[PDB]
Amino acid sequence: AEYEKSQIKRALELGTVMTVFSFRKSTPERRTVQVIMETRQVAWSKTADKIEGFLDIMEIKEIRPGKNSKDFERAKAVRQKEDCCFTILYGTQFVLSTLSLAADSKEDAVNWLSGLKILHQEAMNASTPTIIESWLRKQIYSVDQTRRNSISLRELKTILPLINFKVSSAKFLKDKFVEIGAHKDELSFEQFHLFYKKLMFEQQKSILDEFKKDSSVFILGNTDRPDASAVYLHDFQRFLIHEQQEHWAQDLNKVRERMTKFIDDTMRETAEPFLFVDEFLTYLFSRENSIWDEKYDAVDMQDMNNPLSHYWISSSHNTYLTGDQLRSESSPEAYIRCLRMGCRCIELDCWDGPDGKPVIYHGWTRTTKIKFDDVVQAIKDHAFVTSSFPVILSIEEHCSVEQQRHMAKAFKEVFGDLLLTKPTEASADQLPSPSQLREKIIIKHKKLGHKQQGELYMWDSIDQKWTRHYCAIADAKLSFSDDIELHFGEKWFHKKVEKRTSAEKLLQEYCMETGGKDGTFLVRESETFPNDYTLSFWRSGRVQHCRIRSTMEGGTLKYYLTDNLTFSSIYALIQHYRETHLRCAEFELRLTDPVPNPNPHESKPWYYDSLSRGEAEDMLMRIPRDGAFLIRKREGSDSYAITFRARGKVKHCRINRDGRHFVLGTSAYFESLVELVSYYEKHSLYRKMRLRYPVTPELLERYELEKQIIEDNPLGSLCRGILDLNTYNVVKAPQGKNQKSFVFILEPKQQGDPPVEFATDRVEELFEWFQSIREITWQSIAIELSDLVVYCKPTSKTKDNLENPDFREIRSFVETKADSIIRQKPVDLLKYNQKGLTRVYPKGQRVDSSNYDPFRLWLCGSQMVALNFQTADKYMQMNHALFSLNGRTGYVLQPESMRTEKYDPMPPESQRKILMTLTVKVLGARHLPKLGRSIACPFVEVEICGAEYDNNKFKTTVVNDNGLSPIWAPTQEKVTFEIYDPNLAFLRFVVYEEDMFSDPNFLAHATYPIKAVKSGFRSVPLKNGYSEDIELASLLVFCEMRPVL
């Protein structure tokens, strides 16, 4: 009841103390949990006035009831009974982050679990204008973690970059402030909203102009300013009927419902709802007007009637491995995520386990172990929640017979009714249709009728540490991969500042910029008095200086400002006067803000002063490790510059300096050079290589075939280094060099080549390794399991003999072969696919998990293409598209046309003809996400990801810095992608940032099956790579999907 719901919602907003467990942080802690309604977030606070962490309800994927995930399994859950615990899974990525909360008492938990669900339902159906408010609220909450009603102009200056908008000028912010109408430079939350609603309008006003073409009949009003002109209900209708087409509103009454829904007006109700020229623009760039047809968003029963073969069943390769196939941590959760996404074909590779029960791990790889029982419970519970249509589990068993039995028993008991033990349609000419098997698991195991890859510590000649690398032996070549993951430290100490005037200048700056408080201070060595220091501090608009005196008492050096109070260190002295008032005859003052910019970029080793541009380049070439960097004052200026070595070439990028701010390229504002180096070590400056090595003087003394090489390599794309084993003869070495005792060496026969020194933690490995290198230098299936496999049969057949298909049998072509089949003769794979199941699978080379081009296979009948799902690649994203079509079911009926007499999956160019002529023009953007530490120029590329015959790209001109409102004001664009066959195609919109050194980088992708594209101005919601959804983003586009006849 409405009364009831409100009561639950209220209970959440107040909040309850509920213990929070995570696998990290060991023992449990109790942090009050609240729903903060304006934010739409959930937050846990140690006490009050602090918000440690937030989830966003906007993005909670599941709220499972019991103590089943991680967290609770970890450590001890003695205290809390099963019913009480509730774990929430929130995330934008594949691995989903988990907040696990155990209520003290039963009643609350019921509330929460009901509660979060009540709220979550709402959010998803919140109208665009309502969301914005929350965002803006969220941002305000950002500046200071604790909730604040209003934001000072200074702070607004901090916020505008994070929103990914660059302030044109100090002037620009102020002028807008006036029209908002707060002259005290304390914009009110209500005003902030007025700001946003303006800023956005001012930048994008151009789009509105486009409509104003004669005979459009939208006849939009003057678009001069927000709140000028209006679009009232009569008019909205005429836009919804003509420009965009949506006969949903040939009827006025529903138009009104929509407009009312959008504004979320409350008051402003009653009067025939009307939209301001500003709002029209907020509607356009919003969910409500998605290019996505709603129609293809619900299971269509009519089309779920046909046989399994004719459906493109969704598929996962390895499902258990979250991430890379070599070192990934595999977890039950990995499955749960896949099935809810709506994949209907999980794989479940199984290997012999310690004590009877099978265990799942990638094979011979070092990926972790997941108990089979647990995978099984998990398949059952979450299998058919999202969708009722059938799972096609595909066990591959390396397991021994004794172990296999446990498996079979388990399958039948735990899965219970679901397992499809008996063929549904008796004799059955063709495979049962999905509807018949609805709610039923199908199992495919074979029906009865090594390479010593290990992680080895490696030693280095140069920097003196062992770096862990995974190593693989094939073709007598070890292949290796990149490495596996007091006052002197104080901001306020400025060591030797050369002149008093310099200390005064630094204080004056810091104070001018943020609004310096009395007591803002720094400490420096005294020019006048050896061994003494000088405290310099801000007071009443002027800099004051006090001598910190040193004295020796009892052999210990002591420091003092007044003769009555001696401290053991300068640190202790300063901390004291930060808490206590420094009392002089003329003032009492407490030390407040430390101003920390002496010469941080000079003490540290990685700094060359006056190094010639030429010389450094040469200096750098000598150290060859990729990712080394030298920082060099440019001659004749203030401007520091940075040179790093990558991809052989040495490239140097100019650091300008505006105020106490270093600007690498236009956008970045690192406070201090020390930072610029530090930030980029964690992140990535060029391509994907972090500055990693410092080209110190000291260190300096110390020191297409490639693609072809990549394909063969066991580690494949991942690996850096190939050493021919032939050349180097293995020796085993007693004792440990540089610790890491257990060790081996590979001395090359030729004297010159360096002695690489691979070493290991485990002796066994060493034995294994030593033997393996040394050597280089010199039917199963228990009957019960078999009975289960009623449909989908691993075929013992010559992968050559496509034809004489047997309904029950499923062939498993590996990708490489598959292309070949597809090129040698197109038609045959198709014919086999009608009335038979084929499961294409990823090649072994792909340790990385980048997925093969699904599109060809699908065109010619491949019921199941398994694309690794833990990957963000283009290809996985195309998968998430086909499967949206016809619900999250995960079956999409193959186009009727493909089935027939003469359909050629890849036909001759002359025959194909043209059917459709989509004409995207990209007009807009909004809230594109920020990637790094830079306002991100955005360029959008339309694509028609396609069968080969149709492929095209139409890149859009780059726009300078401005994330909130990038506007490609009618810059021609007007690409005319041509689609030969509509039914399988995709329209892919990707927005790529251009950063510094011009490399496209990836922000967000929209993928949409062509059938579900609606004509007229529409907004394409944008999505991160793992194709979840980023907050209010969009690219207004003007798709027209005229057919040609």
Tab-separated table of C-alpha atoms in Angstrom, residues 271-624:
chain	number	residue	atom	x	y	z
A	271	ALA	CA	-2.180	24.228	-16.754
A	272	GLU	CA	-1.819	22.371	-20.058
A	273	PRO	CA	1.829	21.228	-19.624
A	274	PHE	CA	4.234	23.335	-21.695
A	275	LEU	CA	7.956	22.911	-22.367
A	276	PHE	CA	10.459	25.805	-22.456
A	277	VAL	CA	12.914	25.988	-25.361
A	278	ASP	CA	15.537	25.002	-22.788
A	279	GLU	CA	13.629	21.935	-21.723
A	280	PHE	CA	12.966	20.824	-25.312
A	281	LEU	CA	16.774	20.491	-25.497
A	282	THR	CA	16.911	18.535	-22.228
A	283	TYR	CA	14.190	16.192	-23.539
A	284	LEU	CA	15.968	15.691	-26.836
A	285	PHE	CA	19.245	14.607	-25.190
A	286	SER	CA	17.539	12.155	-22.852
A	287	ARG	CA	16.502	8.529	-22.306
A	288	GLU	CA	12.854	9.229	-23.091
A	289	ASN	CA	13.755	9.809	-26.739
A	290	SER	CA	16.164	6.864	-27.322
A	291	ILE	CA	16.894	5.657	-30.878
A	292	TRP	CA	15.988	2.274	-29.323
A	293	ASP	CA	12.473	1.204	-30.220
A	294	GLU	CA	10.685	0.114	-27.054
A	295	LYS	CA	8.837	-2.534	-29.093
A	296	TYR	CA	11.759	-4.926	-29.347
A	297	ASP	CA	12.149	-4.809	-25.566
A	298	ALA	CA	9.756	-7.629	-24.607
A	299	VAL	CA	9.753	-11.385	-25.230
A	300	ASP	CA	7.826	-12.059	-28.404
A	301	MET	CA	6.089	-15.400	-27.862
A	302	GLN	CA	5.090	-15.857	-31.504
A	303	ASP	CA	8.737	-16.096	-32.525
A	304	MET	CA	9.890	-18.343	-29.662
A	305	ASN	CA	7.853	-21.171	-31.239
A	306	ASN	CA	10.355	-22.269	-33.927
A	307	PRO	CA	13.053	-24.979	-33.247
A	308	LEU	CA	16.268	-24.349	-31.258
A	309	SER	CA	18.445	-24.574	-34.356
A	310	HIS	CA	16.885	-21.518	-35.953
A	311	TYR	CA	17.741	-19.351	-32.897
A	312	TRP	CA	21.065	-17.509	-32.397
A	313	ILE	CA	21.664	-18.687	-28.861
A	314	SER	CA	23.886	-16.389	-26.781
A	315	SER	CA	27.161	-17.966	-25.656
A	316	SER	CA	30.168	-17.601	-23.372
A	317	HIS	CA	33.565	-19.249	-23.952
A	318	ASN	CA	35.210	-19.823	-20.609
A	319	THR	CA	32.692	-18.298	-18.245
A	320	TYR	CA	34.390	-19.010	-14.950
A	321	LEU	CA	37.469	-16.862	-15.758
A	322	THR	CA	36.876	-13.205	-14.877
A	323	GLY	CA	39.625	-11.539	-16.950
A	324	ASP	CA	42.692	-12.985	-18.743
A	325	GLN	CA	42.743	-16.759	-19.310
A	326	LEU	CA	46.243	-17.217	-17.829
A	327	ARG	CA	46.257	-15.568	-14.386
A	328	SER	CA	42.542	-14.734	-13.834
A	329	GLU	CA	40.739	-15.266	-10.544
A	330	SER	CA	37.704	-17.423	-11.368
A	331	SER	CA	34.645	-17.195	-9.126
A	332	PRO	CA	31.073	-18.533	-8.882
A	333	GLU	CA	30.000	-14.927	-9.373
A	334	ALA	CA	31.507	-15.025	-12.847
A	335	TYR	CA	28.647	-17.337	-13.871
A	336	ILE	CA	25.895	-15.435	-12.074
A	337	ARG	CA	26.822	-12.266	-13.961
A	338	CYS	CA	26.857	-14.033	-17.322
A	339	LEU	CA	23.454	-15.745	-17.009
A	340	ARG	CA	21.646	-12.574	-15.883
A	341	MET	CA	23.215	-10.623	-18.754
A	342	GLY	CA	21.218	-13.286	-20.557
A	343	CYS	CA	23.882	-15.611	-21.967
A	344	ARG	CA	22.280	-19.026	-22.480
A	345	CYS	CA	25.243	-21.402	-22.908
A	346	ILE	CA	27.634	-21.238	-19.973
A	347	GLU	CA	30.774	-23.427	-20.257
A	348	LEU	CA	32.058	-25.293	-17.209
A	349	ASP	CA	35.520	-26.869	-17.736
A	350	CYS	CA	36.118	-29.309	-14.882
A	351	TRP	CA	39.315	-30.899	-13.561
A	352	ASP	CA	39.976	-33.533	-10.896
A	353	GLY	CA	39.676	-32.175	-7.365
A	354	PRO	CA	41.446	-32.825	-4.020
A	355	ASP	CA	38.781	-34.907	-2.286
A	356	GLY	CA	36.309	-36.531	-4.663
A	357	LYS	CA	34.325	-33.391	-5.463
A	358	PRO	CA	35.370	-31.957	-8.869
A	359	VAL	CA	36.932	-28.485	-8.998
A	360	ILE	CA	36.903	-25.938	-11.832
A	361	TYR	CA	40.094	-24.191	-13.015
A	362	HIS	CA	41.470	-23.319	-16.441
A	363	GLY	CA	43.786	-26.198	-17.325
A	364	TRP	CA	47.469	-26.161	-16.358
A	365	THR	CA	47.046	-22.400	-15.922
A	366	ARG	CA	47.482	-20.911	-12.432
A	367	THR	CA	43.931	-19.482	-12.218
A	368	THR	CA	42.264	-20.077	-8.829
A	369	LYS	CA	39.966	-22.972	-7.806
A	370	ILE	CA	36.134	-22.829	-7.493
A	371	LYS	CA	34.379	-25.821	-5.866
A	372	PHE	CA	31.978	-27.551	-8.310
A	373	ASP	CA	29.184	-27.806	-5.760
A	374	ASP	CA	29.159	-24.014	-5.451
A	375	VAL	CA	29.103	-23.477	-9.201
A	376	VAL	CA	26.106	-25.824	-9.285
A	377	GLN	CA	24.034	-24.153	-6.544
A	378	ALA	CA	24.708	-20.857	-8.292
A	379	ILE	CA	23.740	-22.060	-11.760
A	380	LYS	CA	20.385	-23.196	-10.335
A	381	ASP	CA	19.378	-20.223	-8.211
A	382	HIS	CA	20.099	-17.423	-10.687
A	383	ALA	CA	19.732	-19.395	-13.914
A	384	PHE	CA	16.212	-18.490	-14.995
A	385	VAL	CA	15.595	-15.269	-13.022
A	386	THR	CA	16.268	-12.868	-15.886
A	387	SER	CA	14.812	-15.184	-18.517
A	388	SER	CA	12.831	-18.426	-18.533
A	389	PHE	CA	14.122	-19.830	-21.858
A	390	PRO	CA	16.697	-22.726	-21.604
A	391	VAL	CA	20.358	-22.884	-20.484
A	392	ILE	CA	22.704	-25.077	-22.593
A	393	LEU	CA	25.456	-25.888	-20.097
A	394	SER	CA	28.457	-27.370	-21.947
A	395	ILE	CA	30.573	-29.450	-19.593
A	396	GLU	CA	34.007	-30.367	-20.902
A	397	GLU	CA	35.493	-32.989	-18.601
A	398	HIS	CA	39.132	-33.762	-18.002
A	399	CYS	CA	37.843	-35.359	-14.814
A	400	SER	CA	38.512	-38.987	-13.849
A	401	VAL	CA	35.639	-41.481	-13.708
A	402	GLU	CA	35.369	-41.685	-9.906
A	403	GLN	CA	35.081	-37.885	-9.735
A	404	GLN	CA	32.638	-37.745	-12.668
A	405	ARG	CA	30.078	-39.750	-10.694
A	406	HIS	CA	29.835	-37.108	-7.975
A	407	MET	CA	29.190	-34.612	-10.758
A	408	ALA	CA	26.286	-36.589	-12.224
A	409	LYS	CA	24.611	-37.249	-8.878
A	410	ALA	CA	24.938	-33.562	-8.096
A	411	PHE	CA	23.488	-32.423	-11.411
A	412	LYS	CA	20.266	-34.410	-10.980
A	413	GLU	CA	19.667	-33.701	-7.271
A	414	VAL	CA	20.533	-30.004	-7.072
A	415	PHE	CA	19.080	-28.963	-10.419
A	416	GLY	CA	16.113	-31.233	-9.676
A	417	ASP	CA	13.187	-31.033	-12.111
A	418	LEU	CA	15.054	-28.784	-14.522
A	419	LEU	CA	17.612	-31.175	-16.064
A	420	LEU	CA	16.208	-32.391	-19.385
A	421	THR	CA	16.562	-36.107	-18.665
A	422	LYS	CA	13.964	-37.302	-21.196
A	423	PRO	CA	13.590	-36.073	-24.818
A	424	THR	CA	10.471	-33.912	-24.797
A	425	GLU	CA	8.926	-34.726	-28.176
A	426	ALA	CA	9.473	-38.510	-28.243
A	427	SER	CA	11.070	-39.441	-31.606
A	428	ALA	CA	11.134	-35.761	-32.700
A	429	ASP	CA	12.140	-35.076	-36.323
A	430	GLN	CA	13.824	-31.782	-35.302
A	431	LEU	CA	15.134	-30.235	-32.077
A	432	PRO	CA	12.511	-29.098	-29.523
A	433	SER	CA	11.630	-25.389	-29.717
A	434	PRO	CA	12.771	-23.101	-26.822
A	435	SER	CA	9.209	-22.772	-25.511
A	436	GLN	CA	8.869	-26.543	-25.045
A	437	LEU	CA	12.084	-26.656	-22.982
A	438	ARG	CA	11.336	-23.412	-21.099
A	439	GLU	CA	12.749	-23.530	-17.550
A	440	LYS	CA	14.964	-26.527	-18.504
A	441	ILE	CA	18.764	-27.009	-18.331
A	442	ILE	CA	20.358	-29.014	-21.198
A	443	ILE	CA	23.785	-30.706	-20.739
A	444	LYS	CA	26.363	-31.401	-23.487
A	445	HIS	CA	29.166	-33.860	-22.564
A	446	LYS	CA	30.697	-36.521	-24.844
A	447	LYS	CA	28.115	-39.280	-25.340
A	448	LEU	CA	29.285	-42.897	-24.928
A	449	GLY	CA	29.252	-44.952	-28.148
A	450	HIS	CA	50.692	-29.333	-20.971
A	451	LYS	CA	53.664	-27.072	-21.905
A	452	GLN	CA	54.786	-26.294	-18.341
A	453	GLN	CA	53.299	-22.767	-18.271
A	454	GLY	CA	54.291	-21.267	-14.893
A	455	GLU	CA	54.889	-17.921	-13.133
A	456	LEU	CA	58.657	-17.514	-12.599
A	457	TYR	CA	60.508	-14.762	-10.738
A	458	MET	CA	63.024	-13.058	-13.046
A	459	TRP	CA	66.130	-11.061	-12.005
A	460	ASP	CA	67.370	-7.882	-13.724
A	461	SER	CA	70.890	-6.548	-14.375
A	462	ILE	CA	69.837	-2.895	-14.034
A	463	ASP	CA	67.234	-1.888	-11.412
A	464	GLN	CA	68.020	-4.351	-8.605
A	465	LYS	CA	64.753	-6.221	-8.025
A	466	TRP	CA	63.215	-9.480	-9.227
A	467	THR	CA	60.111	-8.858	-11.350
A	468	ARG	CA	57.496	-11.626	-11.613
A	469	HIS	CA	56.568	-12.801	-15.116
A	470	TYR	CA	54.378	-15.646	-16.357
A	471	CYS	CA	56.415	-17.914	-18.699
A	472	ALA	CA	55.404	-20.475	-21.367
A	473	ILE	CA	57.452	-23.108	-23.234
A	474	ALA	CA	56.546	-23.854	-26.853
A	475	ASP	CA	58.562	-24.630	-29.986
A	476	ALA	CA	61.612	-24.700	-27.685
A	477	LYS	CA	61.116	-21.010	-26.835
A	478	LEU	CA	60.396	-19.695	-23.365
A	479	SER	CA	57.955	-16.832	-23.913
A	480	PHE	CA	57.542	-14.230	-21.190
A	481	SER	CA	55.054	-11.450	-20.464
A	482	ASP	CA	55.342	-8.000	-18.868
A	483	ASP	CA	55.856	-7.751	-15.105
A	484	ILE	CA	52.996	-8.839	-12.832
A	485	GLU	CA	51.691	-6.047	-10.562
A	486	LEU	CA	60.007	13.894	9.763
A	487	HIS	CA	59.927	17.538	8.624
A	488	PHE	CA	61.644	16.668	5.311
A	489	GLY	CA	58.435	14.911	4.190
A	490	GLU	CA	56.158	17.804	5.209
A	491	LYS	CA	54.424	20.051	2.674
A	492	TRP	CA	55.255	23.157	4.709
A	493	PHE	CA	59.041	22.687	4.683
A	494	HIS	CA	60.800	24.563	1.857
A	495	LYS	CA	64.414	23.536	2.617
A	496	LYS	CA	66.732	26.237	1.212
A	497	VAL	CA	64.654	29.057	-0.255
A	498	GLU	CA	67.321	31.282	-1.797
A	499	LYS	CA	65.839	34.625	-0.682
A	500	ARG	CA	63.333	36.003	1.840
A	501	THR	CA	61.519	37.596	-1.124
A	502	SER	CA	60.924	34.139	-2.642
A	503	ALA	CA	59.220	32.936	0.561
A	504	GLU	CA	57.088	36.103	0.560
A	505	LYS	CA	56.121	35.553	-3.096
A	506	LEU	CA	55.109	31.909	-2.539
A	507	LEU	CA	52.861	32.878	0.390
A	508	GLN	CA	51.344	35.816	-1.517
A	509	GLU	CA	50.486	33.498	-4.423
A	510	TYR	CA	48.947	30.645	-2.448
A	511	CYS	CA	46.961	33.245	-0.552
A	512	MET	CA	45.805	35.114	-3.677
A	513	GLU	CA	44.616	31.945	-5.419
A	514	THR	CA	42.367	30.168	-2.875
A	515	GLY	CA	41.670	33.060	-0.452
A	516	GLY	CA	44.496	32.762	2.058
A	517	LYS	CA	43.709	32.637	5.778
A	518	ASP	CA	45.815	34.200	8.526
A	519	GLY	CA	48.347	31.605	9.687
A	520	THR	CA	49.022	30.205	6.189
A	521	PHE	CA	52.691	29.261	6.543
A	522	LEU	CA	55.944	27.721	5.328
A	523	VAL	CA	59.277	26.876	6.992
A	524	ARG	CA	62.715	27.283	5.381
A	525	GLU	CA	66.382	27.140	6.395
A	526	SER	CA	67.642	30.494	7.702
A	527	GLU	CA	69.889	32.353	5.242
A	528	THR	CA	71.201	34.503	8.101
A	529	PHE	CA	71.694	31.869	10.817
A	530	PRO	CA	73.263	28.433	10.038
A	531	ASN	CA	71.381	25.468	11.566
A	532	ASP	CA	68.360	27.725	12.267
A	533	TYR	CA	65.066	27.951	10.380
A	534	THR	CA	62.586	30.680	9.422
A	535	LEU	CA	58.829	30.291	9.862
A	536	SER	CA	57.057	32.553	7.349
A	537	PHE	CA	53.297	33.093	7.735
A	538	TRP	CA	50.397	35.168	6.391
A	539	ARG	CA	48.826	37.802	8.657
A	540	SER	CA	46.413	40.604	7.726
A	541	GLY	CA	47.480	40.746	4.070
A	542	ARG	CA	51.245	40.672	4.765
A	543	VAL	CA	53.949	38.039	5.271
A	544	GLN	CA	55.609	37.773	8.697
A	545	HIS	CA	58.842	35.902	9.489
A	546	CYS	CA	59.943	34.342	12.794
A	547	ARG	CA	63.341	32.729	13.415
A	548	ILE	CA	63.181	29.147	14.686
A	549	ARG	CA	66.288	28.991	16.891
A	550	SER	CA	68.348	25.838	17.475
A	551	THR	CA	70.191	24.957	20.700
A	552	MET	CA	72.147	21.966	22.020
A	553	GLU	CA	70.890	20.747	25.411
A	554	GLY	CA	72.413	17.569	26.874
A	555	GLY	CA	73.844	16.580	23.472
A	556	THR	CA	70.390	16.704	21.827
A	557	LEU	CA	69.512	19.426	19.307
A	558	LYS	CA	66.355	21.345	20.281
A	559	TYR	CA	64.265	23.946	18.428
A	560	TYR	CA	62.292	26.904	19.802
A	561	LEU	CA	60.432	30.064	18.765
A	562	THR	CA	60.085	31.353	22.343
A	563	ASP	CA	62.718	30.738	25.020
A	564	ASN	CA	60.175	28.959	27.269
A	565	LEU	CA	59.253	26.074	24.921
A	566	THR	CA	61.817	23.699	23.367
A	567	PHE	CA	60.974	20.902	20.908
A	568	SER	CA	62.941	17.810	19.857
A	569	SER	CA	62.251	18.473	16.156
A	570	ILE	CA	60.903	21.150	13.803
A	571	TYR	CA	57.997	18.781	13.098
A	572	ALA	CA	57.028	18.750	16.794
A	573	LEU	CA	57.386	22.548	17.004
A	574	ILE	CA	55.110	23.148	13.996
A	575	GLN	CA	52.428	20.634	15.050
A	576	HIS	CA	52.317	22.366	18.457
A	577	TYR	CA	51.683	25.803	16.897
A	578	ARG	CA	49.026	24.325	14.586
A	579	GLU	CA	47.040	23.364	17.710
A	580	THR	CA	48.208	26.190	20.012
A	581	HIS	CA	48.382	29.954	19.419
A	582	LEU	CA	51.804	31.472	18.765
A	583	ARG	CA	51.764	34.330	21.290
A	584	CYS	CA	53.864	37.413	20.551
A	585	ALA	CA	53.557	40.873	22.119
A	586	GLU	CA	51.626	42.105	19.059
A	587	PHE	CA	49.453	39.075	18.166
A	588	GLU	CA	48.066	35.624	18.853
A	589	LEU	CA	47.999	33.448	15.716
A	590	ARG	CA	47.584	29.717	15.049
A	591	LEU	CA	49.298	28.106	12.041
A	592	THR	CA	46.604	27.125	9.518
A	593	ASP	CA	47.184	26.080	5.891
A	594	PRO	CA	50.676	24.835	4.839
A	595	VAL	CA	51.781	26.206	1.451
A	596	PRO	CA	53.969	23.413	-0.072
A	597	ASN	CA	55.812	24.474	-3.237
A	598	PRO	CA	59.559	25.089	-2.599
A	599	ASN	CA	61.398	23.228	-5.359
A	600	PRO	CA	59.905	19.702	-5.153
A	601	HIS	CA	61.071	19.228	-8.737
A	602	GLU	CA	64.817	19.662	-8.077
A	603	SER	CA	65.770	17.576	-5.037
A	604	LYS	CA	64.589	14.378	-6.752
A	605	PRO	CA	67.020	12.431	-9.010
A	606	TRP	CA	64.946	12.439	-12.196
A	607	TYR	CA	65.678	16.100	-12.997
A	608	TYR	CA	68.112	17.420	-15.590
A	609	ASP	CA	68.806	21.165	-15.531
A	610	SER	CA	69.773	22.653	-18.910
A	611	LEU	CA	70.013	19.245	-20.584
A	612	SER	CA	69.874	20.056	-24.303
A	613	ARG	CA	66.836	18.754	-26.184
A	614	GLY	CA	69.277	16.979	-28.502
A	615	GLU	CA	71.463	15.565	-25.713
A	616	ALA	CA	68.608	14.126	-23.640
A	617	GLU	CA	67.205	12.288	-26.650
A	618	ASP	CA	70.664	10.751	-26.944
A	619	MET	CA	70.839	10.283	-23.163
A	620	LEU	CA	67.542	8.413	-23.310
A	621	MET	CA	68.427	6.167	-26.241
A	622	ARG	CA	71.153	4.571	-24.107
A	623	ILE	CA	68.701	3.242	-21.510
A	624	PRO	CA	66.463	1.051	-23.723
